[PDB]
Predict the 3D structure of the following.
Amino acid sequence: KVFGRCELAAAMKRHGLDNYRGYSLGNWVCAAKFESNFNTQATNRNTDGSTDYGILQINSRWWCNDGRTPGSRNLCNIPCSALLSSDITASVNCAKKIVSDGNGMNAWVAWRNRCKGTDVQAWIRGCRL
Ligand code: NA
């Protein structure tokens, strides 16, 4: 599923991400835009053999099990394929764990390089929320 911008903002709000750990909704929408282009089915393979999955590009070395990342953890206790669903619940619940770790949203490369320090409220402007 490729979400619209305001559609995704509303779904993320319903699942409790607005101001989660102090990160306003626009931060989450901006991260999704630059991680996956709002596409739940996005995947990308990394040099280390891990793969990133779904709308927030959650990595198989630490967070989910894909059966092909040796020596990895599954800290979200989910198959990585669950992160590709049109239902973003599993991705949101896992993202809540990730952001609660020591580095906050700096865990997401695209957030740190493309969203942090910018007018992230623009990503929710105009939306019915
Ligand atoms: Na894993």
